Structure 1
Amino acid sequence: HQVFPSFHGADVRKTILSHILESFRRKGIDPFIDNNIERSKSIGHELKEAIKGSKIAIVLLSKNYASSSWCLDELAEIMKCRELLGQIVMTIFYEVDPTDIKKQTGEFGKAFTKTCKGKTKEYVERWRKALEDVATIAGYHSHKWRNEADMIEKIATDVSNMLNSFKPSRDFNGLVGMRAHMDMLEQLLRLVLDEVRMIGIWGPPGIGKTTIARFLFNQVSDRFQLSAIMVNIKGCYPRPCFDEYSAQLQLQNQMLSQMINHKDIMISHLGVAQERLRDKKVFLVLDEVDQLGQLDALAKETRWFGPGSRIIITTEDLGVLKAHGINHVYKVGYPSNDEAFQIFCMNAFGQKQPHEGFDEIAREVMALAGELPLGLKVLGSALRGKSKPEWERTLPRLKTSLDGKIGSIIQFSYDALCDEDKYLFLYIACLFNKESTTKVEGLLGKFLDVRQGLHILAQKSLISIEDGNIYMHTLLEQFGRETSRKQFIHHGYTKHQLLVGERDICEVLNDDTIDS
C-alpha cells in the first residue's frame, strides 16, 4: 500500500476523512480502503497484514476513537508495527487534546473506560500503552490550525514528501567499478581522525569525478551532522566577475542556504560560514572548482568547519589544489577493459552487460572510445536501438569525427589555456603523441617554452608523462587533429598549420593556392 488510514467511522467518515482522501487522491496517494469486513467484530488477518504492508500509517484520533475495540486493536497493531517493522505513524488529533489521550481523561477517557469493561487486563494494558505512545508522537492538532483546508493540504504534502524519499537511491547500481573508487577514497578520508581534513579529486574531463563525488556523498553524508553538495561551481560562477566580492558572497550564500536548510538566507560579511559551521561536523562536496577565489568563498580554512568535517573538492587542474594547500589528492584512473565494455554495453544494449550478438562491432567501437566513461557513454548511446548493418554504416562517421557531446566538453576544457599551451596541445596531438619529453624540448624548444607548457598541460590533465614519455588520450588527440583544420599556430606571428589528416593531405597537396 501507500498509506493505511486508521479512523472512527461514525465521527469522521462523512466530514473530514472525505476531504483528506480527496486531497490524497489528487496528490496520487492511494490508501487502503476497508470494505467494512466486520463492523463490530475482531480485526483478524488481512486487516493485520494490511497494517503490516503499509509504508505509512495514519491515525486520525477523535472523541469516540476509544469507544470501539476495533479502532483500539488497529492502533495497538499500528504501534507494534511502528516498533518492530519501523513503520511511519502520523497522528491527527481531530477536536481532541493530546493530553486527554496520553492520560485517557475527559470524554476520551470516559469512552475508553466504558470500552474497557469486561475486557481482560492484558488487552487493556496493550490498549493504553498504545494510546500513551500515540499521544506523544508529533502530529497535527486541529485546534491549532487556522482552517481545515490548510491543515489537510499540509498533511497531504508531508505524506507525499515521505513517500518520495521512502526508498534509497538505486540509479547508481548502473555504474561499474565504484568499489575501486570508494576504496581509494576511504584511505584518504580517514573518517575516524576527527580533523577537518580536505580532500581533492582531480582527473581529465568526463572521467567520473562528478559521479564519484555523488556516490561518495550518498554513501557517507548520513554519517555527518550537516552536509551539502555544490554541483558545477564553475558553471554558476560568472567569468567576467567585475565585482568578485559580490559573486563570492552569493556563492557562500548558496552553500549556506543549501546546507543549514535556511533557504531564506541573505548574509552581510564573508565570515558567516565560520560562525554557523564552527561547532558542527560538516560533509561538504564542492564540485568543478576552477579558481582560488571561489574556494576562498566556500572553504578557506579548516578552522571554519569544526571537528570531524570533510570537504571534498573535485577539480580538473592540480594547480588550484596545490595553491589552496590540499595535499590529499585522488587521481581518478581509467577503468579496466572489462569494466569499459560493461559501461559500453549499459549504454548500447539497454542495461545488459552481455553483448546481444553484436560483440564484434561492440569491441571496435569501445576501442574507438578510449577508456573515458564519457566517451563510452556517448558512443554507446549513439548506437542503441540500431541493428548490426546500421552499426557498420554508422561506424565510419563515428571513427572520422568525434561526437559533439564529447567535443563540447573538451572544447570547454580547451578554452582555458594560454595560446602557447594550445599550440603545444596541437603539436602533441598531431606529431609528438608518444615521444621522449627531452626530444620534444629539443625540437620545439626554440619558440614554444615547452617545459612550462608540458607542466601546465599535465596539471590540467590534458596529458600525462610516464617513464619520460608524453601520452595523450586518444579521444583528446582526435579533438586535436580535428582542431588542427580550423585553427593555426603562431610562432612569432606567422601562421602555421599541422598537416596530419589521412586522405585530407592528398587534395591539399594537389593545389596551386598554397603558402608553402
Structure 2
Amino acid sequence: HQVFPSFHGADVRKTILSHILESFRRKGIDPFIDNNIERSKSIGHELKEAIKGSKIAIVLLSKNYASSSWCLDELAEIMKCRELLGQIVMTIFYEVDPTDIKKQTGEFGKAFTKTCKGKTKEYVERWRKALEDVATIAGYHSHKWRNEADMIEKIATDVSNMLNSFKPSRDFNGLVGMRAHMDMLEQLLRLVLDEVRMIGIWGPPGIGKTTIARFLFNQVSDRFQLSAIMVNIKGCYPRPCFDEYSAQLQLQNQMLSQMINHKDIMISHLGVAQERLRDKKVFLVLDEVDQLGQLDALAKETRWFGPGSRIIITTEDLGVLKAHGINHVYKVGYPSNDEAFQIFCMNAFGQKQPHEGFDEIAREVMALAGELPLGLKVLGSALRGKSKPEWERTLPRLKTSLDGKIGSIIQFSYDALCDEDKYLFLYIACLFNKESTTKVEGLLGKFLDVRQGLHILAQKSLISIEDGNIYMHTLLEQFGRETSRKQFIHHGYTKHQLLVGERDICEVLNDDTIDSRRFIGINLDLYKNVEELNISEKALERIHDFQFVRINGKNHALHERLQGLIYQSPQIRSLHWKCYQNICLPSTFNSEFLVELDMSFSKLQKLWEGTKQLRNLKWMDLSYSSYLKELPNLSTATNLEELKLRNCSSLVELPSSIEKLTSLQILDLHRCSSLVELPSFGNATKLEILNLENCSSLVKLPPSINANNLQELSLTNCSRVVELPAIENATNLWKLNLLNCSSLIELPLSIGTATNLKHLDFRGCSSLVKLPSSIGDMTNLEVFYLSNCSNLVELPSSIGNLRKLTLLLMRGCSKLETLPTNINLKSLHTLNLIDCSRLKSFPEISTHIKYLRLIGTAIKEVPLSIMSWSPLAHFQISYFESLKEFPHALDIITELQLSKDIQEVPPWVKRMSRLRALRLNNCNNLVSLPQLPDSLAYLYADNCKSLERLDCCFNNPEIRLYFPKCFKLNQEARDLIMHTSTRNFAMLPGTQVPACFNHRATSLKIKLKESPLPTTLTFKACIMLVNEEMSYDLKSMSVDIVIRDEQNDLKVQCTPSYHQCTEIYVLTEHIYTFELEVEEVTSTELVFEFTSVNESICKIGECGILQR
C-alpha cells in the first residue's frame, strides 16, 4: 500500500474523506481501500497485516470516532506500530479539540465512555493510552484552517513529501571503491576533535571529487545540527565579476538560504554568517572552488562556525588551498585496475560489474581510458548497446580521438592557465611525457621558466612528479596532442608547432604551405613495418630545422630519407633514437648545439669518424648499442655530466681524452664486456656513481679517483682485477661491493676513510691475502660479509674499534687461522664461522654474541670465560671426541654434527641439555642413534648406512625426524618414527604407503568414513611423491590440505591447514608423514585433498591416511 487511512465511516466517509481521496489520487497516492462489507465487530488479522506494512497512517478524527470498537482497535494498532516500527502517523482533528481527545471529554468523551462499557480493563487502558498519544502528536486542526480545500491540499503535499524520502539513496549504490575514500578521509576528519578543522580535496578533473563529496555528505550530515552542500561554485560565479563584493554577498546568501532552509532571504552585510553559525555544529561542503574570493565569501575564518564543525572544499589547484592555510588535504588517488574494470563494465554492460560474452575488447578500451572515472564512464556509455563487430568498428575512431565529453571538461581547466603554462603543457604532452625534471629544465630553460611552470602545473594537478621524473595522465596527454594541431607555441612571438603522429607526419612534411621554421619538435613512433617511405623527393631538399628529435624506431628495417631529412637541421638540441639500424652517423650532421644524445639501441660503429666540437653537451646514453667498437674523441666536452655506456659489450677500449671530462658525474659501464683498461680521469672530475658490474675482461684501473663525492662504486664480477684505485675522503660511500671480484690482491688503505659505509661485502673475493689495517677507522659499519674468501690468513686487530657491526659472516675462509683476541665488540649479534678449516683456536671476543656457528672448524677446545655470556640462542659446534672434559660447554650448546665416521654412540648427549637440533652428516659406520635428550626438536640423517635401532621414546615437542637415505632400519624403529606424535613432517625410506594407513588412494582425492559419534578427530597422513627427476640437493617442500564432504558441500576447517619445511629433502622413494585435526562433526563425510605447492618441483603421488 501507500497510506493507511483510519476513519469513522458514518461521520466522514461521505463529506470530507472523498475530497482527501480525490486529492491523493491526483497526487499519485494510493491509500489502502476497505469496505463496510469488509468489517466485522473485530478487526481481523489481514487488517493488522495491512496496517503494519503501510509505513504511513492517517488518523482522521471525528465526533463519533470513539463510538466504534473497530476504530479504537485500529487506532491502538496504529500507535503500537508507531512505537515499535518506524511508522509515521498523521492526524486530522475534524472539528474536535485535541484536548478533548487527550482527556476523553466532551461529546467525544461521552461516546468513548458509552463504548467502554463491557470491555475488559486492558482494552480500556490501551484505548485511553492510544487516545492520549494520538492527541499529543502534531497534526492538522480543521478549526484553525480557514479553507478546507487548502487544508486538504496541504495535507496531500505533506504526505507526498514524507513519502518520497523513505528509501535513502537506494539507487546509485553501484559506484565502485568508495570505502577506500571514506577510510582515507575519516583520518583527516577526526570528528572527535570538536574543532572547526578545514579539509580540502583536490585532484585532476574527473576523478570523483564531486561524487566523493556527495557520498560523504550523504553519510555524515545527519550527525550535524545544520548541514548544506554547495555545488559547482566555479560555474555559478560571474566570470568578469565587476563587483566582487556583490557576487560575494550573493554567494554567502545562497549558502545561508540553502543552509538554514530559510527561504532565500536577503542579507545585509558579509558578517551575517558568523552571527548565525558561530554557535552551532555545521557540516558544510563547498564544491569546485576556483579562487580565493569564494573562500573569503563562504568560510574566511575558523571562528565563523560553532565549536565542533567541519567544512570541506573540493578544488582542482593546490594553490587556493595553500593560500587559505588548510594543511588537511586528501589527494584523491586513481582506483585500482579491478575497480576500473568494474566501473567500465557498469557503464558499458548495464549493471554487470563483470563483462558479458567476450571480455576482450573491454580491456583494450579500458586501457585506452587510462584510469579516470570520467574517462571510464564516457567510454562505457559510448560503447553500451553495441555488439562485438560494432565495438570493433568503433574502436579505431575512439582510439584516434577523444570524446567531446572528456574534451570539454579538460579544455575548461586548460583554459585557466597562463600562456607559458599552456606552452609547457603542450611541450610535456608532445615530447617530454616521462623525463627527469632536470633534463626538462636544461632543454627548455631558455624559453619558459620551467621551474615555475612545473610548480604551477603540479599544483593544478595537470601533471604529477613521481620520483625525479614528470608524468601526465594519458587521457590528458591525448588532449595535449590533439590541441597541438590547432594551436601554436610562441616564445617571444615566433610561432611553433610540434609534430606528433604515427606516420601521419609524412603528409605534413610533403607540402608547400611550408616555412622550414614552424616545426621544432618531432615525436615519431614507428612500430609497424613501412609500406613505402611516404616522404616525397622534393621535401628532402628542404633545410628545415628541429630542436627536439625523438624517434622510437622499432624494427630491423632502415630509414634513409628520414635520416637525410632530419640531419639537414643545423642546430639540433636533443636527439633520441631507438634501434638506429645504421653503421655510423652521417658526416653532414652538425653537433655544436647538442645538449642530450641517447641512442638506446643502435648498430653504430666508430661514429663521427673523426673529431668534432661538443661545447654544451650534458647527457650521453649509448646503452645496449652492442655493435659499438670505440668512441669518438671526447676532447672539448667539458660540460658533460653523465655517460651511460650500459651493456655495450664490444667496447674494446675507451678514448684517452676522458681526462678532460671535468664535469663528469655518473659513469655507467655495466656489462661493457670487451673492456681491457680504464684510463685515468683527472683531478676535478668528482665521479659520483661509478658502475662496472660485469666487466669480465677489465684488467687495469686508474691509480686514483679523487672521490670526494662518490656515493656508489660497484665492481661486482670484474673477475680479473689486480689492484684498486685509491680514494681521497670517501665521506659519502653509500655503497661499495665487490661480490666475486676474485684475483684481487689487497685493498687500498684509504677504504677506512669511509665514515658512513654501513654495509660491506667481499663474498667470493678469493686470493685476497689480508685486510687493510685501517678497517677499524670505519664507523656505522653494520654488516660485514666474507664468504669463501680463501687465502685470508689474518684478521686485523683494529676491528675492536668498530663497535657497531651486528653480524660478521665469515664462511668458507679455509685458510683463516687466527682472530684478534683482546677485543670486546659491544653489539655483535652473530658470528658465522663455518668450514673455517684451519681456525684451530676458539674465537674469543668476549661479547654479547647470540648466534655462534662453528661447524667444520678445527678448534677442539672450549674456554672457561663463556659463563660470562649469559644468553646464546644458537651455539653450533661440530662434534669432536674430546668434548667430554668440558662440562661448561655442554649446558650452553644448541646443535651438533657428528662427523663422516663415528662408531661410538655417545651417551653423554643425554646429560647435555639444550639440543634443539642434532645432525648426522654421513657416519656410514654408526651402530645406532644416541638416546635423545629431553630437549630435542630436530633430527637429521642426510646420508647413513646402518641405523638398526633408535632406542629412545622421545616426546618433547613438534620434533622433525628426517631420514633421507638410511635403509637398514628395524621395523620397530621405523614404526616409532611414523607413530611418534609431532606437528611437523617425518620422512623415511620407503617404496609404498605402509599398511598401517588403511585409507588409500592415488589434486588427488582421499575418501574415508569415520566411526565416531561426535568429537574432535585426529588423523595421520602418509604421502609419497610422483616419480620424477628429483634433485639429490632438492631441499624445500610445502603441502596444503583441503578437507570437504560429499553428502554436504561444507568445506570443513583443518587446524594445521599447511605444513612447510625449508630444509626437508625432496626425493622419490620416500614416505612423508604428518598430523591433522578436524573438529566439525558432519559424521560420515570425510574427503581429503593434499596438494603440493610448487608443482613445478614436487607432485604428490600415492597417498594414504589413518585415524586415531
TM-score range, shorter chain: over 0.9
Q: Give me the whole-angstrom Cα distance separating, in 2, the residues matched to 1:114 and 1:276.
A: 55
Deviation of 1:513 (Å): 1.8
Deviations 1:115-139 (A, max 9, x none): 0001111100000000000000000
Q: Choose between structure 1 and 2: higher strand proportion.
A: 2
Q: CA deviation at 1:261?
A: 1.0
CA distance, structure 2, for counterparts of residue 137 and residue 508 of structure 1: 80
**Deviation at 1:37?**
4.5
CA shift, 1:361, in A, is 0.1
Deviation at 1:415, TM superposition (A): 0.4
What is the number of equivalent residue pairs in this alignment?
515
| Partner in structure 2 of residue 243 of structure 1 | 243
Distance of aligned partners of 1:75 and 1:465 in 2 relative to their CA distance in 1, 3 Å threshold: same
Please report how far the alpha carbon of residue 358 of structure 1 lies from its aligned counterpart in structure 2 after TM superposition: 2.9
Q: Please state whether the residue corresponding to 2:350 is helix, strand or coil.
A: coil
**Greater Cα offset, 95-104 or 39-48:** 39-48
> Residues 463 and 472 of structure 1 are in contact (CA less than 8 Å); yes or no, is this contact kept in structure 2?
yes
In 2, distance between residues paired with 1:22 and 1:213? 41
Unaligned runs of 5+ in 2: 516-1108
After superposition, residues 137-152 of structure 1 pair within 5 angstroms as 137-152=137-152
Cα deviations by residue, 1:476-498 (Å, 9 ceiling, x for unpaired): 00000000000000011000000
1:174 counterpart SS class:
coil
Q: 1:223 to 1:491 in 2, by over 3 A?
A: same
How many Å apart are 1:319 and its aligned residue? 0.1
Aligned pairs for 1:415-454 within 5 A: 415-454=415-454
Q: Which residue matches 2:190?
A: 190
Q: How far did residue 40 of structure 1 move?
A: 4.5
Deviation at 1:239, TM superposition (A): 1.0
Change (3 A) 1:245 1:97: same
SS in 1 for 2:45: coil
Kept after mapping to 2: 8 A contact 1:172/1:215: no
Residues in 2 aligned to 1:315 and 1:171: alpha-carbon distance in whole angstroms: 27
CA distance, structure 1, for counterparts of residue 264 and residue 393 of structure 2: 55
> Counterparts of 2:4 and 2:443 in 1: how far apart (Å)?
77
SS in 2 for 1:201: strand
Larger mean CA deviation between 161-170 and 364-373 belongs to 161-170
SS at match of 1:164: coil
Q: Please give the alpha-carbon distance, in whole angstroms, between the structure 2 residues aligned to 1:279 and 1:362.
A: 53
**C-alpha deviations, 1:134-181, integer Å up to 9, x for none?**
000000000000110000000000000011111110233110000000
Q: CA RMSD in A?
A: 0.7
Q: Is the 8 A contact 1:198 1:326 kept in 2?
A: yes
What stretches of structure 1 move > 6 A for 4+ residues in a row?
Answer: none
Counterpart of 2:282 in structure 1 is 282
- In 2, the alpha carbon distance for the partners of 1:508 and 1:258 equals 56
- Cα deviation, 1:203-228, whole Å, max 9, x if unaligned, reads 00001100000000000000000000
Q: Which moved more, 1:164-173 or 1:43-52?
A: 164-173
Q: Give the drift of 1:65.
A: 0.3
| TM-score, with structure 2 as normaliser | 0.46
Is the contact made by 2:2 and 2:30 (CA closer than 8 Å) also made in structure 1?
yes
Give the Cα separation in 2 of the matches to 1:170 and 1:470.
Answer: 42
Give the C-alpha shift of residue 264 in structure 1.
3.2
Which moves more between the two structures, 34-43 or 137-146? 34-43
For residue 475 of structure 2, what is the aligned residue in structure 1? 475
Q: CA deviation at 1:512?
A: 2.0
C-alpha separation between the residues in 2 aligned to 1:30 and 1:36? 19
* d(CA) in 2 for partners of 1:38, 1:101: 27
Q: Is the contact between residue 205 and residue 316 of structure 1 (CA under 8 Å) also seen in structure 2?
A: yes
Q: Distance in 2 between matches of 1:504 and 1:423?
A: 22
CA–CA separation in structure 2 for the residues paired with 1:358 and 1:139? 59
SS class of match (2:126): helix
* Residue deviations 1:53-75 (CA, integer Å, cap 9, x gap): 10210000000000000000000
Shift of 1:234: 0.1
- Render the CA deviation track for 1:366-389: whole Å, top value 9, x for unaligned: 000000000000000000000000
**Per-residue deviation at 1:41?**
1.0
C-alpha separation between the residues in 2 aligned to 1:264 and 1:200? 27
Distance 1:86 1:241 in 2: 50
- SS at structure 2 position matched to 1:58: strand
Is residue 2:332 matched to residue 1:332?
yes
- CA–CA distance in structure 1, aligned partners of residues 102 and 321 of structure 2: 58
SS in 2 for 1:90: strand
Shift of 1:35: 2.3
CA-to-partner distance for each residue in 1:82-111, whole Å, 9 max, x for gaps? 000120000000010000000000000000
- Map Cα deviations across residues 321-342 of structure 1 (whole Å, 9 max, x no partner): 0000110000000000000000
Q: Is the 8 A contact 1:288 1:314 kept in 2?
A: yes
**Aligned partners of 1:107 and 1:267: how far apart in 2?**
51
Structure 1 counterpart SS, 2:111 = helix
SS at match of 1:192: helix
Residues of 2 paired with 1:62 and 1:264: CA distance?
39
Cα displacement string for residues 256-300 of structure 1 (whole angstroms, at most 9, x for unaligned residues): 000111123100110000001011000000000000011000000
State the shift of 1:436 in Å. 0.3
Separation of aligned partners in 1, 2:503 and 2:402: 17
Q: Are 2:201 and 2:314, in contact at CA under 8 Å, matched by a contact in 1?
A: yes
Q: 1:342 aligns to what? A: 342
Q: Which of 210-219 and 162-171 deviates more?
A: 162-171
> In the aligned structure 2, how far is the partner of 1:497 from the partner of 1:116?
96
d(CA) in 2 for partners of 1:170 and 1:302? 35
Tell me, in whole angstroms, the C-alpha distance in 2 between the residues paired with 1:455 and 1:384.
Answer: 40
Contact 2:254/2:264 (<8 A) preserved: no
Equivalent residues of 1:102, 1:131 under 8 A apart: yes
Aligned to 1:312, what secondary structure does the other structure show? strand
Confirm or deny: 8 A CA contact 1:91 1:140 kept in the other structure. yes
Assess if the C-alpha contact under 8 Å between 2:201 and 2:209 holds in 1: yes
User: How far off its partner does 1:501 sit?
Assistant: 1.8
Conserved 8 A contact 2:284-2:310: yes
How many angstroms apart in 2 are the aligned matches of 1:443 and 1:102?
A: 88
Q: Distance in 1 between matches of 2:414 and 2:60?
A: 62
- Equivalent residue for 1:317? 317
Contact kept? 2:4, 2:51, Cα under 8 Å: yes
Greater relative contact order (Cα 8 A, min sep 6): structure 1 or 2? Answer: 1
Question: Residue 429 of structure 1 contacts residue 480 of structure 1 at CA under 8 Å; is this kept in 2?
Answer: yes
User: How far is 1:307 from its partner?
Assistant: 1.1
Q: Which moved more, 1:160-169 or 1:372-381?
A: 160-169
Q: Larger deviation: 116-125 or 32-41?
A: 32-41
Deviation at 1:511, TM superposition (A): 1.3
**499-508 vs 223-232, which moves further:** 499-508
| Corresponding residue SS for 1:86 | coil
8 Å Cα contact 2:253/2:264 also seen in 1: no
Q: 1:64·1:111 contact (CA, 8 Å) conserved in 2?
A: yes
Indicate the percent of aligned positions where both proteins have the same amino acid: 100
Q: Residues 68 and 115 of structure 1 are in contact (CA less than 8 Å); yes or no, is this contact kept in structure 2?
A: yes
C-alpha distance in 2 between matches for 1:279 and 1:480: 49
1:354 is displaced (CA, Å) by 1.6
Unaligned runs of 5+ in 1: none
Q: Check 1:356–1:171 CA distance in 2 against 1; reply closer, same or farther (3 A cut).
A: same
- For 2:170 and 2:14, the matched residues in 1 are separated by 41
Query: How far 1:38 sits from its partner (Å)?
Result: 4.5
**What's 1:12 paired with?**
12
- Does the aligned pair in 1 maintain the 2:55–2:86 contact within 8 Å? no
Give the Cα separation in 1 of the matches to 2:357 and 2:13: 60
Partners of 2:247 and 2:338 in 1: CA distance: 44
Out of 163-172 and 201-210, give the one that drifted further: 163-172
Find the counterpart in structure 2 of residue 87 from structure 1: 87
